[PDB]
Amino acid sequence: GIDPNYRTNRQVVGEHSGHKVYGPVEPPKVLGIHGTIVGVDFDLCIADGSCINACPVNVFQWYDTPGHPASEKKADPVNEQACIFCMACVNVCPVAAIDVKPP
Amino acid sequence: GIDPNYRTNRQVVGEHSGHKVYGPVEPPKVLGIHGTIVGVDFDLCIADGSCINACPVNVFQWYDTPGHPASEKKADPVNEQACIFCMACVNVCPVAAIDVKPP
Numbered sequence: 001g002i003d004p005n006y007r008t009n010r011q012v013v014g015e016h017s018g019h020k021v022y023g024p025v026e027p028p029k030v031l032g033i034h035g036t037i038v039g040v041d042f043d044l045c046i047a048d049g050s051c052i053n054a055c056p057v058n059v060f061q062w063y064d065t066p067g068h069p070a071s072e073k074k075a076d077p078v079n080e081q082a083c084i085f086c087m088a089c090v091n092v093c094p095v096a097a098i099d100v101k102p103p
Numbered sequence: 104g105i106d107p108n109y110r111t112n113r114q115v116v117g118e119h120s121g122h123k124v125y126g127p128v129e130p131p132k133v134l135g136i137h138g139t140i141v142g143v144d145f146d147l148c149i150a151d152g153s154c155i156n157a158c159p160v161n162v163f164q165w166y167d168t169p170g171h172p173a174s175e176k177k178a179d180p181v182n183e184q185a186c187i188f189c190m191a192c193v194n195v196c197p198v199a200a201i202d203v204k205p206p
């Protein structure tokens with residue numbers, strides 16, 4: 001599962017669709033974590049889709065990541081700021097790849 | 104159109120589904136304004152639906168108001184806190200019944 005201390009343990013290295021990306025990032029095998037309010041560890045995500053299936057406010061969208069060993073698609077927190085802190089995604093993810101921290 | 108100063112001009116008289124309701128409220132003809140972040144004047148709303156049709160984060164839901172002269176259904180800001188301040192609803196409403204104020 002995702003490191004609950006990722007925001008302090010990792011370096012921010014870039015930005016994607018309005019959110020920060022925490023490294024290391026060495027495409028295509030290592031993609032890091034996307035998001036600050038709603039963080040998704042792309043290296044753990046296996047594209048199960050329960051998060052997208054549970055979120056009532058459309059926080060996630062599928063984002064293609066060809067060449068990644070865990071999956072070739074990931075749930076990207078494009079609308080992380082719409083999060084109403086349901087904590088559903090955090091609990092439905094079979095690999096515990098999501099961490100939500102209210103700002 | 105809605106009074107942009109409604110939050111100070113009107114009295115809060117109740118709560119509905121997690122949001123405040125600003126009076127006067129004398130059902131069924133006078134229902135007031137629902138919401139603080141995303142305020143919808145139920146007395147102006149005619150159930151056009153453009154707001155629901157435009158909102159990407161599901162802020163609104165239909166709420167029945169039988170007996171109201173403007174319409175018998177209203178767009179209720181059930182998820183006002185998911186608002187990402189698109190200002191779309193504010194502009195699509197044909198009667199300017201919506202006012203959005205970031206907290």
Ligand code: F3S
Pocket residue numbers: 040044045046047048049050051052074075092093094095096097098
């Ligand atoms: S595996 Fe990925 S698709 Fe969602 S349910 Fe977990 S973050």
Ligand code: F3S
Pocket residue numbers: 038054055056057059082083084085086087088089090100
């Ligand atoms: S289910 Fe959606 S509302 Fe936030 S707690 Fe997860 S991104």
Ligand code: F3S
Pocket residue numbers: 143147148149150151152153154155177178195196197198199200201
């Ligand atoms: S009329 Fe009502 S249904 Fe929406 S578009 Fe205007 S608040």
Ligand code: F3S
Pocket residue numbers: 141157158159160162185186187188189190191192193203
């Ligand atoms: S379109 Fe939706 S995101 Fe807010 S500005 Fe209106 S309730």
Ligand SMILES: [Zn+2]
Pocket residue numbers: 016017019034035076077078
């Ligand atoms: Zn991203």
Ligand SMILES: [Zn+2]
Pocket residue numbers: 119120122137138179180181
């Ligand atoms: Zn309401």
